[PDB]
């Protein structure tokens, strides 16, 4: 089964193989008095690995690299952070020191610098307008518009029909909004509609935090965001 928040100690990282050459990575972090799970993605790219998002902190991200070496044994050569918050760029310095080329959109890099978060080194061009898509090796990167943050990207793995929604997509067990301080609530449903229209074939949808599902996670997130909008 998919590992849940209460069975991962803070500091440990679990890997979940979704398909040949596609994994999620799952870590936990304590925030504001609670413990949260957090997901990212690993995609095999020939003899190398592409990493999507850190494991939420330098300590977790070091453990992430250790678990990848243990369970996969291929080198992580590039990493993409899907927005500027610490569950996505926290650990970029660890990755850079290990020889990983770290990437984010110019928007994410700008917002990380303002916030004082770690800044991925390389820039992802071609993603500044809502609906923009670019290929990045074995994945497609998609900017759906502002949602959880103004810079959030989603990631699609065509070989496996895996859609990583990042923090713009909520797991089912989350029925209230949570951290929307940086969100565009007015645009978030429209941005989710763009995801649906661009990846209607997705079979395996991974939220930023918690259990994967199908495309029903998009409807779920829209429902939850609209309820927050109305209260
Ligand atoms: O909503 C998120 O994407 C997130 N990431 C880290 C922490 N959070 C919030 C705060 C309650 C869940
Ligand atoms: Zn965030
Ligand atoms: Zn998050
Ligand atoms: Zn729901």
H, E, C per residue of 93-137? HHHHHCCCEEEECHHHHHHHHHHCCCCCCEECCCCCCCCEEEEEC
User: In residues, how long is the chain?
Assistant: 231
Q: Is 15 helix (H, G, I), strand (E, B) or coil?
A: strand
- Of residues 25, 39, 60, 87, which has the active-site annotation? 87
Contact assessment for residue 118 and residue 85, using Cβ atoms and an 8 Å cutoff:
no
Resolution in units of Å: 1.6
Q: SS3 helix, strand, coil % of the chain, rounded to 5?
A: 25, 30, 40
CA-wise closest residue to 199 among 164, 170, 224: 164
Q: Is 87 a catalytic residue?
A: yes
Cα separation of 182 and 161, whole Å?
Answer: 29
Element counts in the chain: helices (H) and strands (E): 6, 12
Q: Is 228 a catalytic residue?
A: no
Q: Which of 167, 177, 217 to mutate to test the pocket of ligand 1 (most atoms within 8 A of CB)?
A: 167
The strands making up 162-166's β-sheet, listed across from edge to edge, are 132-136, 139-143, 154-157, 162-166, 204-207
Between CA 10 and CA 30 the distance in angstroms is 7
Beta-carbon contacts of residue 93 (< 8 Å; ≥ 6 apart): 58, 118
H or E segment and range at residue 40: strand 34-45
Contact 95, 57 (CB under 8 A): no
Domain boundaries, the chain: 1-231
Contact of 163 with 202, CB cutoff 8 Å:
yes
C-alpha to C-alpha distance for 194 and 200, rounded to whole angstroms:
10
DSSP 84: S
Sequence-ordered list of residues with C-beta below 8 angstroms from that of 114, at least 6 positions apart, any chain: none
Which alpha helices (H) appear in the chain, and where do they start and end?
58-71, 86-89, 92-97, 106-115, 188-198, 216-229
* 47 appears as a binding residue in the annotation: yes
Distance of alpha carbon 67 from alpha carbon 196, whole angstroms = 33
- Provide the angle, in degrees to the nearest 10, between the axes of the packed helices 216-229 and 188-198: 170
Asked whether the beta carbons of 150 and 84 are under 8 A apart, the reply is no
Does residue 83 have an active-site annotation? yes
Beta bridge pairs of residue 141: 134, 155
Query: Is 118 among the annotated ligand-binding positions?
Result: no
Mutate-to-test residue for ligand 1 from 26, 28, 30, 31, highest number of ligand atoms within 8 A of CB: 31
Residue 12 marked as a ligand binder = yes
Q: In the 8-state DSSP scheme, what is residue 5?
A: G
Find residue 139's DSSP bridge partners: 136
Instruction: Name the experiment that determined this structure.
Output: X-ray
Question: Phi first, then psi: what are they for 164, rounded to 5°?
Answer: -95, 110
Rg (the chain; Cα; Å): 16
Q: Integer distance in angstroms from the first to the last C-alpha of the chain? A: 35
The answer to whether 143 and 128 have CB atoms below 8 angstroms apart is: yes
Contact by Cβ (8 Å): 99, 164: no
50 has which bridge partners?
Answer: 43, 78
**Alpha-carbon dihedral angle through residues 96, 182, 211, 194, given to the nearest 10 degrees:** -100
**Those residues with Cβ within 8 angstroms of residue 21's Cβ, 6 or more apart along the chain or in another chain:** 43, 44, 138, 159, 160
Nearest CA to ligand 1 atom 6: 87
* Residues with C-beta less than 6 Å from any ligand 1 atom: 31, 36, 87, 148, 167, 178-179, 208-209
């Amino acid at each position: 089964e998919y590992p849940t928040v209460s069975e991962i100690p803070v500091g440990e990282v679990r890997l979940y193989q979704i398909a040949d050459g596609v994994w999620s990575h799952i870590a936990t972090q304590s925030f504001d008095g609670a413990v949260y799970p957090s997901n990212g993605l690993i995609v095999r790219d020939g003899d190398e690995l592409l990493l999507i998002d850190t494991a939420w902190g330098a300590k977790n991200t070091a453990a992430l690299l250790a678990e990848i070496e243990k369970q996969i044994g291929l080198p992580v050569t590039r990493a993409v952070s899907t927005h500027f918050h610490d569950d996505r760029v926290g650990g970029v310095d660890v990755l850079r020191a290990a020889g990983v080329a770290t990437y984010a959109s110019p928007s994410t890099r700008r917002l990380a610098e303002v916030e004082g978060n770690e800044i991925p080194t390389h820039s992802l061009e071609g993603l500044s307008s809502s609906g923009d898509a670019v290929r990045f090796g074995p994945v497609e990167l998609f900017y759906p518009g502002a949602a959880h943050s103004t810079d959030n990207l989603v990631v699609y793995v065509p070989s496996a029909s895996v859609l990583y929604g990042g923090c713009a997509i909520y797991e089912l067990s989350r029925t209230s909004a949570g951290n929307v301080a940086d969100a565009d609530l007015a645009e978030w449903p429209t941005s989710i509609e763009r995801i649906q229209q661009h990846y209607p074939e997705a079979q395996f949808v991974i939220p930023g935090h918690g259990l994967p599902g199908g495309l029903d996670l998009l409807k779920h997130t829209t429902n939850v965001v609209k309820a927050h909008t109305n209260r």
